[PDB]
């Protein structure tokens, strides 16, 4: 009744057939993420092959695929960087949280797509109060790690981080993004360090805030 290599072989046979659409690819990648399958690389490679091969894309399949690519820790630059086509073609059609996961996944891999980050920055500064601050930190992570030195998005994020109380993981993401940008604006950093008062639920996030406060050379907190 609980056989996980059986479902691994059945989703291996799901993405080994010849006419797999994008939604089966998305759900297979999401099922591989939730199952923590880091030993088997060939199955992740089949999912990435069919992810690059698939052509039709709606919002939710693309964002579930990109979320799975982040969270699984899988990287293949050609497939992820060729997913900027479905991203930039569906950018008004993406929700705020969907735009956050798309720009976070395409920034964290290193895709150099200045149309995507410009048309994402215009959306974040056009609808700024409409976004949850974790989505603000996700787009800040993406535009920072996508090679765009965006002052406008950084300042419009810093005003929100002065205005809104944010989460610990959100603060760690914004610290990592501002350290990649190399800003050290104290009016944002000390506002983001009042969010490490609950404790940090993921020590990846405490480690990332450690590295960001070290590269920006602020404090031991």
């Amino acid at each position: 009744e609980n056989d996980v290599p059986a479902i691994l072989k059945e989703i291996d046979s799901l993405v080994s057939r010849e006419a797999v659409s994008a939604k089966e690819v998305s759900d297979a990648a999401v099922a591989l993420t939730y199952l923590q399958v880091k030993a088997n690389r060939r199955l992740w490679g089949k999912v990435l092959e069919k992810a690059g091969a698939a052509q039709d894309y709606d919002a939710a399949s693309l964002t579930n695929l990109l979320w799975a690519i982040n969270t699984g820790g899988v990287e293949h630059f050609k497939t992820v960087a060729e997913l900027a086509g479905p991203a930039v073609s569906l950018l008004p059609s993406l929700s705020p949280v969907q735009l956050s996961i798309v720009v976070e996944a395409l920034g964290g891999a290193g895709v150099k797509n200045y149309e995507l980050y410009n048309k994402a920055s215009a959306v974040v500064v056009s609808k700024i109060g409409e976004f949850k601050p974790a989505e603000i930190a996700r787009v800040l992570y993406g535009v920072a790690f996508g090679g765009v030195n965006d002052v406008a998005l950084a300042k419009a994020a810093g005003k929100v981080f002065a205005s809104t109380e944010v989460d610990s993981r959100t603060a760690a993401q914004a610290l990592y993004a501002l350290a990649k940008l190399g800003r050290a604006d104290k009016a944002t950093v000390d506002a983001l360090l009042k969010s490490f008062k609950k404790g940090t639920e993921s020590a990846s996030d405490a480690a990332a805030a450690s590295f960001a406060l070290g590269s920006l050379s602020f404090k031991a907190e």
Binding site: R41, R42, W44, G45, K46, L48, E49, H76
Partner: protein
């Protein structure tokens, strides 16, 4: 001159104006298209020993 009342067109000329081209056998189409579709099978099947699918869309290991 009895020979001038015989038909002047020889039996050779009849046999070379009637059977002018060597006709195409029907099994030639089968054997030629089979020897070429064997190459279509070899390159493009997913069960052949020499498939092109790993030389064309390599892998992702």
């Amino acid at each position: 001159d009895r020979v001038l009342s015989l038909p002047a067109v020889s039996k050779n000329q009849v046999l070379e104006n009637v059977f002018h081209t060597a006709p195409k056998a029907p099994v030639e189409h089968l054997e030629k298209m089979v020897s070429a579709n064997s190459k279509v099978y070899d390159a493009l099947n997913l069960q052949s020993k020499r498939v092109l699918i790993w030389q064309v869309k390599p892998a992702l290991f």
